[model samples]
Target chain A: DKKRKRGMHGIESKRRKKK
Target chain B: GTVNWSVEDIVKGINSNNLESQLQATQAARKLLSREKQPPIDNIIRAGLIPKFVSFLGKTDCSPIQFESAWALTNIASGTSEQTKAVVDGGAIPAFISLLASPHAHISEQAVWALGNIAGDGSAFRDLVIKHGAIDPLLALLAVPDLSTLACGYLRNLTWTLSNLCRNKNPAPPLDAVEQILPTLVRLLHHNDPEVLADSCWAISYLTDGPNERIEMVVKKGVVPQLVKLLGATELPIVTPALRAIGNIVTGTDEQTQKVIDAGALAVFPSLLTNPKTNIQKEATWTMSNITAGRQDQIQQVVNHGLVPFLVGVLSKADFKTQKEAAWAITNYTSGGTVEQIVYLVHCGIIEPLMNLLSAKDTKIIQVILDAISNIFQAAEKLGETEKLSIMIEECGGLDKIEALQRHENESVYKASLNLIEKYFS
Candidate 1:
């Protein structure tokens, strides 16, 4: 989702854990 | 050989008469775009691959071409917002949604991943997917027990898309659409898949970050205890978003935040601070920041857990992201702290790092650090330890640094610096 995509950079992250 | 290969040749190959040529060309493009690193989708876009793939989305019979095209589009949308905009402009979203209903799981999964990235662009674009009626197909991936006891292999990406759609920042999630999908989101919180569980936490984080009633709605669904239980998970993947959801929940009413704290959110946080992962630290400290932002009872929840040494220790991290947030936690505590609460920081071993941040160049960092520092000086003043605190700042070279901040360009920075000087250095 945009969260993982947005986690590419920034202070507020929508991060994902990689496999 | 691929280094010199051009998307132009692939375009021509797609236009080739031989069926073999089409799949081979699409495969070459697919393999490149799918790399974990920067996949020259920008270059491919310039070479005119966007329109070709959009057309392929509507293909009725060619799974190979459709598969490769969907795979390429997924990676393309994964790029920068501007890079992603090209796919949206080329009209790939409708094509992506159509393929979500494809019989081949591979094709539909790729389509879901692509549309999730598209929805991540923000609310209006997410609304575009909603406007086209995305809910039913998105939910279908999360199978009911009519046959399969487990979620499908692709269910995670569907929730990933679902998580992104739930990422709206308005006073509430798009109320009509969000209301329809929120129950399944609550159900997935207990899902066995770690990926599904993490994505579900992320969705709850987004949904709870809004206004009071929305968080009340989420709590009404009975998700708070589930979020707290996930704190014991060893995987940072599971813990990160679990903390995020709790972090957002703490922003709601006192009743809402207490539900989180009463569920044992604070008890598990001290050990989380020991984990080396900044992602976990970031989420964990954000929970602290918000906790301290609450009322006297709420601030005591953190203070009672003996987080002073623990949180002050975290300020030394190389990550300024969390450091600034830690500064915020202290700022809130100092603003609302009792004489003892504020005085506790004066001795908690935070001043060295607090003084060390005087050189921070970011406006946000500078402001938060200054606010936290100024409040400490105020705390020391009340304790009649002002001169002692001033000497400590001088030993750390903090006085000279904040003195230089007197002329900072931002009005807030200058005022905060002047206030610290007036109260502490005078």
Candidate 2:
């Protein structure tokens, strides 16, 4: 079987855009 | 106006030899792009910040640089379709798509979020993302474990991005793009996370909104049953998108529409008619209109579910949009209803409101109401109520309403008015 893969994501509150 | 640093000043700082300078420049770009005011962004765009942000997305070794570049582009993309197009034109698409496969989740996530914003921007730039092969990488996120842990986590962000990809209005996502995501999309309909499920349902809605082939693709994925079961979720997040998806689905061919009814759309709908949210109820009404728009046998299935009662309840009290959809639903089944289906609606207390809607302000509603009245009369004639409604129509001054339209503009309205006069008034 092949290994599964996945990512810093913008799952951050959209309100926190300053960062 | 302290235009202290030109966009060029920020630009050189972004690629400055010092690492601090690089992050500072990108951060400044981010702040400038984030301004609520527009002129600074105008200066930023003219100074060519987008390609710079997109250029950083291509930085392989430095995650920080990659994130800043993508984050900068992400905010830029959030601006307008024109700005989104700038990022796309600066060749942001491939970099964003490439980052979807990155080892660093942060890098990939920012890129994904940026691409989402790109696709969400407007039709043109969204088409650019699709053109560059974003679908596979986007769908590949579902295969990743531990994606949606936080309240609005990676999975949420990823799905929301894909959700927008599917949700475009002007040009719509490419059919090939839509075709590729079908299996994953249907599977997502049952995701335990409501946000994930909501995003998935929005995708389905967009997919179904495409050509009939696109509609059939989701339907064939066996989404109807999955969606029907989800209808029980009750929360607007879970239920509304599910309803909208189904609403779009029923617009397909007879076989597809029949598939929806056969899948329990009718069985669960009686209560959804009164779902607390007006939009949810309107979607339900809109959906019922399409289902009833099916053929004779389809109408029979709907009526057997006792669809008429929900419609009458909506017709009497709902807003204009819902009222029209409700009236349209009744129009379909009533137009297609067998003698008894007609009689059942008549006995179910629909006629009084049909008569009441005669004075409705919108001619479109008035037209539909009158059309429904005529169809009801035709059905009533078959079931022995045509003369009964004829008197109701007469007492309500129906001919005057019909005659008043004779002198009106819209031809169909004019002819429809006269047709009623010839058939009923004469």
Candidate 3:
């Protein structure tokens, strides 16, 4: 199951790398 | 130390001496009285030797003595510590300030230098000097071509001291006093002499570091382009200070930043990056970095100018410091954009070098790399590409291992790794 959300703009991508 | 000569003898020395003789005598006096390993002219000024010195001001035969006296008083008043207090306490302020109104060109020049040094001292004498009406005289001297060089240096030091004196963080000068001098000093920046121009640039830059109403005032006064031109001038002796001034002006103020961009500075910086001189390249990169701060469009402009490739070329031959600075600048330029900037960065293959920098031991360099990567990540997120982001992160050995993130040693790294594992589990 791919946890990555496609085209998630408003939802704030959790997989987004936190610096 | 009682001497054979009285104050009257010193006055006679001034009135009787020829130019060469006066110069010799003055140099002798300066040498004997010098307190530090350097010249100790301040010691004489503090010893109430000013009246004897001032007596030469009107002597036609002793013009050099008068000139040296003024010059000596300037050096004394300008000293930073106990000497400044001594000179001011010796009642030199009023006499020195009075010389500001002297019609003789040499006397006025000497007075300007002296007043400037007094103002630069940052002591109790600051108020006494200021109250004696020093600002207008300094500004007036800024216009005289013959005197502008030394006068501007003194003015820059004075303005910087006065600005610091107004700082709220410590016991400083009155706000009203600072306000009075601010405008006059700002006007001095418009002078044509590059020295004066550079000094005024620094003074303004110091005054308006953060985004505030004062920045708007500076922009309205037309300092942005003037400073930018100075930054680009090849003949300027020290570009870093001017570049630093440019950085200060554009840091947080949108209007000032835009003014810098509009002045064609954005275009000039890429060439600066490519200049053979390392110091110029370093300062230029720093200026570009500061101007591009938090502004996505300007970043796009920089990228469009092929700055990434130019910076990459710089990275190949640059030492570690230069490479780090150029990488940080590229990072700042590409910040706050859509996926386009990220895609551009990725296509250029610049990430690999940046990743290498992330592992560098210099914490500041590490922070810059992290900031750049974070901005790229933001652009990536806007593009909504988890796969691409993951690939970049994995290639860089995941975010947890970056130098800044690993600052806490084993425990923080362990906790962070555990947290990542937990995320995978959930």
Candidate 4:
């Protein structure tokens, strides 16, 4: 939801699980 | 005739100055490593064959030698990170990148496979492969359908390697590198091969998995419609990554979210929500959450599409992880939706199952669930229906459940519960 800009919560990187 | 050569003989043969011996040795070692059960990767590595294999990739005149060596290096790089590093340390990266342009499609495909393995090992190597200019050649291979007489094998391998290129974050793939491949990935979304489609979607997902700028780039490249179409693909391998890409796109600015909406992503929500696989349910709800998080009309479309009922169903029936994602969908809506939307969520029986999750062990889930409940109360208050909503929570035993959360081990959960009780129950 693009919350708390600049110094907000950590962003979760949506990487696929490595095979 | 298959030679039953020992690992040492294979090693020595690869070392000889004789071209035939070198070719046969690499083939022998490749076969040894290709054994069904446990391939002797350590034995082959122990035989000092990695450097030899790396050298053979440079034998441009002999596609067989390059193919055999790249195949061996692919498997070698597929091993543990250390073994993969040995291949990287053997200077296989530049060798493999150069072969991405090999005239033989099979050799180039094998080289792509080797590079995928190496890139997938970690972010640094992925960056290293990109730094050496792997993207231009790989994209060239993918761009031409007639490159290998339209073999889907080369397309599949090239797309998969591109996914590896996009895989890691924290230091996300260089934006220039991502920009270079976005158009190619957009093109491959329409490819007929399921493998190619899956990896293409995955690469886009990885590429868009970071900042708003990246998501905007892919969205502008006209990927949303093909991605929406791919969501209905019968294969999970294909749909999951497609769903992931859509989810990532919606996570961007509202304009990007609207692009996904314009692509007809909402129509698929019912099918995805009801998917037998929890992962599908999780991803679809996650996508829904971000969509619901957008502007009022955007949130209205989520309701207009009738996604609320399906999301409420997920809250009640799906696995806890899926339930958590569903919780975000509800909570984000509660935080951003029109009052009517919050009332509709209550009408669809969202509270009991939502409050039922107060006992969830995950702090994130608890935090979002509490936020949703609080948002509902605030919305109800604004509508002057606070008593009706409070009675609903009290009747559902949600008040008691939330009160119990005050004892939760996580400070965040405990404090949130305390605030909810003080702000409303008191």
Candidate 5:
């Protein structure tokens, strides 16, 4: 949670974002 | 990114899961496989992942993971727009190409489909795809009855991609590739399925537009009559693409136009003109204009087929552009030395409508009217029959009225009248 993501949305968020 | 699936596992999973669960998983896999973040999948795809997909696809019991993976691969491979970059970067171009060698129908189909997508961009990978022998597989697939759907779609996409690839100011690989694909693609237009026929027609249209040789190849395949048949199909979905295909095919040369006329394509125009579908009507009119331009004999065939009555019916209802197009098409046919066609125009009472066009505000319509009048006079002269010439002169209000037209506001009108008089006096 503390880590900042890179690119459009953080790479990890990409999976969750779709869900 | 790449979730490996064993054939047994997929079957077991499918068997255990409720229908809903299996559906959800398949959907989810499709989504994930489609996602840009799935680098393993992306990397495999970028690396030209065909061989790997082929190896998995060969097993009798393909796992859900494998099935979904193949589906994802097929989805990505089918597109020309995006995700191809990953396919290239992953260095699978050679491997993807290698899949074309597989005798397995599905694998070969997928490979060609994927290559179509890859080649659609017309980039660095084009040479590699060609070099890897993609064409032979595509051609072979065309022979397989079971694979015709996928084969046709793949070939259509491939040819379209090749056409795009081949388009350049200097015209290098695009032209070269088209020379290779055009003949085979054109033959495919005769396929029984409407979908295949439509795709093949479009591919030929796209490729032939590039250069004269390619266009010649399309004509050699005898596509015009088949395309005309498709244009007349009862299904509306099939008609528009066929119209567009015919339009593209006839655009470049008068020779092709003659071929289309010889094929009875002119007989099909009347219905298209009267079709309630504006796009279909517009495309038909536009195509008719191009094909008949400066070709009086072919234009007569169009009239003989009763195009005038259909055009006249549409004149009042058509928008300004359609009406203008119809007028110009009629003008092209009746102009030149086609006196018989002019008499038909006269017999149909079209001269009044054309003369009425002269008074319209649009300068183009006025120009068209003047051109038509000149054609009528010239056609009469060619007939060398005094009665016809006298009738034309009278209808045109005698030589003095014709001379008066020479002083009309438009320079073209003046020149047209002078030309007509010169023909009459000569």
Candidate 6:
């Protein structure tokens, strides 16, 4: 069993660029 | 600039039965009304001229009257929302929509400009504009044999209206309507005019700002190549929206991310990250963070393109808000990156700037950094270099920082720091 698998984070709504 | 006539005089002329008098009256009203500031719109409305202007939109024999009428209504609609409602209440929506296909390009241009003001006033009016069939004819302008055949003003007004139709999203424009607009948006991206390019990119960005389906719709149109080219445009207006539209596309699924990458987005990163404008730098950084959040081979494109140093640079000195985005870029790599990738991040000196963020006031920042450090330590352990990497972290003062964070007031930060120290330091 894998002891640690890396976690990927997504772009939060706060971080998305506004027009 | 001559004001020999009052609004009532304009109204009397408008009230005349003679077409010539009405034309002169509406033209005078439009001239007075179109002033950029304090255009006497209330007086014009109070004089009961909105219906008269609205009436001319249906005038079949007089293109000039229709043009002036649409122009007057456009300026009125550009006023308060109530003024816009007056134009709508006068039954202008269908009239303006029908004028979209007018044989006279300038007449059609006037109508599109008028609809743009109405749609731009608010979301409800925006939907009202779309619901009355503004979408197809507006897009149809771009389908001409050569855009050069259309005057710059006509194209500008047309594209600007297209953007308004796609702009707001608290209640997004109907998906069916958006689908109809995508092909033209993709076509407009190749336009020689920067304003057209800017509006099209914004329209695409608005359409794609929601569900992945909208993003997928844009990608399917083969727009990525032109979007990548626009990133390097000299005009900020052009580049900003193009970057936003591309940024939204990357937020879609992995295949969508790869589609963008394969279209040559990676090569544009250095310029965008190093862009003179901080907003561009911040957006470019956040955009790359999403791409870095993709699959490993996708992550490798970021590293291979020589962008890791720029990410480290932003983390070291960009504004805190942008530094937070840079932090996400690094942490996402650490979280999903391979041992070799994590080692590359360490070699690029991501640890020191990354660790400096531990002192960041934002709990979310602290938590992300803690996770990144744990991932690196885990990578070190897997590589059989745990002791060596721990010394690097200690030398960078991260070891002491991690120990200090064990007592962080935030429960999640404390739990993460405590778990990190217990698992690795012990």
Q: On residues B301-377, what C-alpha lDDT tens digit does candidate 5 reach at each position?
A: 66778776776665545766677777766666665425666777666766555654554566667677667766666
Report the lDDT tens digits of candidate 1 across residue range B47-86. Answer: 8888888887777688888988887777777777787789
Per-model DockQ? 0.07, 0.05, 0.01, 0.12, 0.01, 0.04
Among residues 3 or more apart in sequence or in different chains, the pairs in candidate 6 whose N, CA or C atoms overlap within 3 Å are none
**Whole-model lDDT for model 3 versus the true structure?**
0.57
- Candidate 5: regions farther than 4 A off: A1-19, B1-29, B33-83, B102-107, B122-128, B145-176, B252-255, B355-370, B373-426
Supply candidate 4's per-residue lDDT for B32. 68
Cα displacement (Å) at residue B154, model 1: 1.2
If ranked by DockQ, best first, what sequence of candidates would result? 4, 1, 2, 6, 5, 3
Q: Write the per-residue lDDT of candidate 3 for residues A1-19, one digit (tens) a residue.
A: 0000010101100110011
Off by over 4 Å in 6: A1-19, B1-4, B16-19
What is the per-residue lDDT of model 6 for residues B1-426, given as tens digits with 9 covering 90 to 100?
Answer: 324468878978888899999898888887887665578878888888888888898997998999888887887887787888888998999999999889998788888888888887767989998889888888777788888888887887788888888877778888888888877777777889988988888888777787777778778888888888898789999888888888888887899889889989989988888888888888888888888888999989999999999899989988887897887887788888999999998899888888888877888889878878888888998989888877887898988888999888999988999998787677
How much is the lDDT of residue B180 in candidate 1?
84
lDDT of 3 by residue, B341-382 (tens): 667877787676676665556656655565666666666656
- Candidate 1 vs 3: which has more lDDT: 1
Weakest ten-residue segment in model 5 chain B by summed lDDT: B163-172
Model 4, residue B292: C-alpha shift (Å): 2.0
Provide the lowest-lDDT 10-residue window in model 2 chain B.
Answer: B143-152
Ranking the candidates on TM-score from highest down gives 4, 6, 2, 1, 3, 5
Write down the worst ten-residue block by lDDT for model 1 chain B.
B145-154
Off by over 4 Å in 1: A1-19, B1-13, B16-52, B80-83, B146-152, B168-173, B312-324, B339-426
Distance from true position, residue B216, model 1, in Å?
3.7
- Please state the CAPRI-style docking class of candidate 3: incorrect
**Runs in model 3 lying further than 4 Å from the true structure:** A1-19, B1-37, B40-68, B78-80, B123-128, B140-192, B275-279, B311-335, B367-385, B388-426
lDDT of 4 by residue, B72-113 (tens): 888878888888888899999999989887778788778888
